[PDB]
């Protein structure tokens, strides 16, 4: 395993083998590779176009080096992120409804800019994002929800932080977050930012060992279920990968005006979310529901997408209540309430 | 000039504008860009494939930041790993008989095959201060410009190139950044692909005439064994030209006779060639000098240049002694001569 050899291989645009990639990612994540080569490799990897074997090798490296808690039965809802519009953090609200019907081990992080990351939104609601493993398991048993902070459960990732920071461009690490759940959740609704990554990440998930994971791409260009048009889906399980297309109306709704679904900070997201829980915002609430509908289908509790949206309707009703208990047990209820107020409670 | 914008642009595999690439190069060569980004940038450039404008941009940048001296009237024979003897250095010597030569070059990484290694083995003092450089060109019509010193800014990208260990855009710029700003030049390239690219870049670097060549089986000089693909670049345009060593009238030289494995051995073969004691090497020296003579427009064709070179090689040893006597140690040259 020589870095220089791996780099020439990449310069020649030839894909890496699984364990070749896994040893490369380990060396990188452990801080054994000079910053200059980590840089060259990440750029070469992206310009070559990372492959299935690459993604799988890196994902397995990160899982090996990660801090783990056990909750396979749990479900996660994390997208890749991607550069785009900047819609409201549905994966975080959709995760609140889901705790009402199944343990949720949400994997997330802080966003680099306007605080569009789930860790920022949750912090805005008053949640204590730093949950040690012993207590995390405790919180999932009492509230059926726990937030797993990437920077906390992947301490070795601090070894690639400066390079990623300095480069300032997306790399292979920006699509690995959702495939590296510290609780090893076997169910997941992974949002992807492009129809290509849809196929790439699905073939990779197939070899990552999930019971059922659904990857989705939102028609506008969103890493979530599309509010306006079709939603391209991939449902991977131990028995294959199903392709599924879906318009917003198949849920029994009329196109949700994007204008109302856009946010420009962690607080506006927190506020809008709550406002939807308070029934004071149809659109944002309808957006949350369609996303929750799919997550429910992945749990195979609901056998249809229209049905899932319906059950999500019931769920959102106990949502603020659920949110209150979640925060009061691990966080500051004060903020939550000053937000309920800023969102008219 | 925002490096992240440039980076993203390269990541999307799109070429840069000339001055966009020039500002990027100036910032890099000035050491104003974190190593992490210089690294990402060089790698993106290589993987995207450097275009004409990026080459021009970088060359113009190194030219401005380089330690300069002025001898536009001079010619240079700098090119861009078979171990063949360095004929551009010997060839530079013949040319100094009829025109000022400002030879730009570095040492070879490996077994001293670089112009600087050969010259030093001949007894020449390859480290020539810029103020002394122009005096030596007036007095002897020849001077060697050690790139490593005439391009001090390059230290800002040394650690990065060292760590990457792969070729970058920098491995092909040297010949386009002559410190004396020589307008006449013969520059070898190591692949046909670099012929088209470098010729188009060179086209825009303000030469009076530059001849680019690629010789089989893969040499940055005129092929002594077969074809030589050549690009004649000038204000009037780019001439595509193919050639065969047999058009010089000679028979293809056996490659084994041109290869050396030592700086001193290369010095010895050049002198034996100068003494009439090695036809093959001297034939390889003359076919290279012939194209350069054509670059200076001293001859009307390659055949005339070859015969002209015949006359120049007969005088090159004494010329060599004159050059070294003014800058270097003639005792080292008398030693190389002792047994050649
Ligand atoms: N997209 C993610 C999902 C989960 C954890 C981290 C990330 C991240 O981008 O760092
Ligand atoms: N960006 C990430 C992706 C996956 C795991 C951890 C991180 C992190 O920043 O700590
Ligand atoms: N590698 C180079 C290319 C051009 C000019 C100088 C150098 C140098 O190393 O000094």
Swiss-Prot record, chain A:
Which SUPFAM superfamilies does the entry mention? Nucleoside phosphorylase/phosphoribosyltransferase catalytic domain, Nucleoside phosphorylase/phosphoribosyltransferase N-terminal domain
Q: Where are the transmembrane segments?
A: none
Instruction: Output the Gene Ontology cellular-component terms.
Output: cytosol
Binding residue positions for anthranilate 2? 164
Q: Which residues bind 5-phospho-alpha-D-ribose 1-diphosphate?
A: 77-79, 82-83, 87, 89-92, 106-114, 118
* Reactions catalysed: N-(5-phospho-beta-D-ribosyl)anthranilate + diphosphate = 5-phospho-alpha-D-ribose 1-diphosphate + anthranilate
- Mutating residue 106 to Q: what's the consequence? Affinity for phosphoribosylpyrophosphate is similar to that of the wild-type enzyme and catalytic efficiency dedreases only 10-fold
**Has keyword Transferase?**
yes
Q: Where do the annotations place Mg(2+) 2 binding?
A: 223-224
Task: Please name the GO terms that the record assigns under molecular function.
Answer: anthranilate phosphoribosyltransferase activity; magnesium ion binding
Residues annotated as binding anthranilate 1: 79, 109
Which NCBIfam families does this one have? trpD
Q: Which family does it belong to?
A: Belongs to the anthranilate phosphoribosyltransferase family.
What do we know about how this protein assembles, alone or with others?
Homodimer.
Listed name of the protein = Anthranilate phosphoribosyltransferase
Q: Which organism is it from?
A: Saccharolobus solfataricus (strain ATCC 35092 / DSM 1617 / JCM 11322 / P2)
